[PDB]
Amino acid sequence: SVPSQKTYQGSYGFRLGFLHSVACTYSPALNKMFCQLAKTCPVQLWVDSTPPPGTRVRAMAIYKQSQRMTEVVRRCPHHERCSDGLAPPQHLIRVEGNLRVEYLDDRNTFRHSVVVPYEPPEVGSDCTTIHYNYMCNSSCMGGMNRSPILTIITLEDSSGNLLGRNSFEVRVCACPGRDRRTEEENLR
Ligand SMILES: [Zn+2]
């Protein structure tokens, strides 16, 4: 199967925002994050009303291209062998700066995902920020090998039921800023 990427703002009005970290930069035009391997990628959760406690936030990668859409995205054999003792070595996406990160493997599809409890916004902020880290380069042969991926962020209840969904393309690369410019120029 292929995980849905259909935007679903849902009853809480769930949207994503993005911040400069260049460790991490987001193109609204491309709906695409460009980021460096292992660096901080701040992703903002915006809601119109507050989800209940017990609400959870999952991140999962999938291949964008139809020829690989059913394939599990995971770290290349090299980077697998390179943890914090939290993230399983195979998992492409980690969360940093959170004591309650769950690393999950689907029973049926073998897809990886990383889940944290939903927290309402901190002081000074209208949104909740999660700091992801991507642990393998888009160009790694024997992994992504240049195939684009999407990260899907799902808001869920405690039983795993869908409350909201949004998604963004990701390229993990040496110079996010330069690569963003190159891809945005190919637009005009
Ligand atoms: Zn790699």
Q: How much of the chain is helix, strand and coil, in % rounded to 5?
A: 10, 35, 55
Cβ atoms of 14 and 163 closer than 8 Å: yes
- Any bridge partners for residue 134, and if so which? 93
How many CA within 13 A on the CB side of residue 103? 17
Ligand 1: distance of its center to the CA of 53 in Å? 36
Ligand 1: distance of its center to the CA of 11 in Å? 38
Give binding residues for Zn(2+) as ranges: 76, 79, 136, 140
CA 142 to chain centroid, in Å, comes to 20
Ligand 1: distance of its center to the CA of 108 in Å? 25
C-alpha–C-alpha distance, residues 119 and 50, integer Å: 9
Q: Tell which phi-psi region holds residue 9, choosing left (phi > 0), alpha (psi between -120 and 50) or beta.
A: alpha
Q: β-pairing, 24-27 with 162-172?
A: unpaired
Give the DSSP letter of residue 128.
E
Give the DSSP letter of residue 8.
B
Ligand 1: distance of its center to the CA of 79 in Å? 5
Cited resolution, angstroms: 1.9
C-alpha–C-alpha distance, residues 67 and 158, integer Å: 33
Listed by start position, the domains of the chain span 1-188
Cβ atoms of 118 and 55 closer than 8 Å: yes
Which CATH code, of 2.60.40.720, 3.30.70.330, 2.40.50.70, 1.20.1730.10, is assigned to 1-188?
A: 2.60.40.720
- Give the determination technique: X-ray
Ligand 1: distance of its center to the CA of 145 in Å? 9
For 44-84, the three-class secondary structure string (H helix, E strand, C coil) is: EEECCCCCCECEEEEEEEEECCHHHCCCECCCCHHHHCCCC
Cβ atoms of 1 and 109 closer than 8 Å: yes
Distances (CA, A) of 40 to 21, 78, 100, 118, 119: 7, 21, 17, 19, 19
CA 143 to chain centroid, in Å, comes to 17
Ligand 1: distance of its center to the CA of 133 in Å? 13
Q: Which residues surround ligand 1, an ion (CB under 5 A)?
A: 76, 79, 136, 140, 143
Ligand 1: distance of its center to the CA of 149 in Å? 14
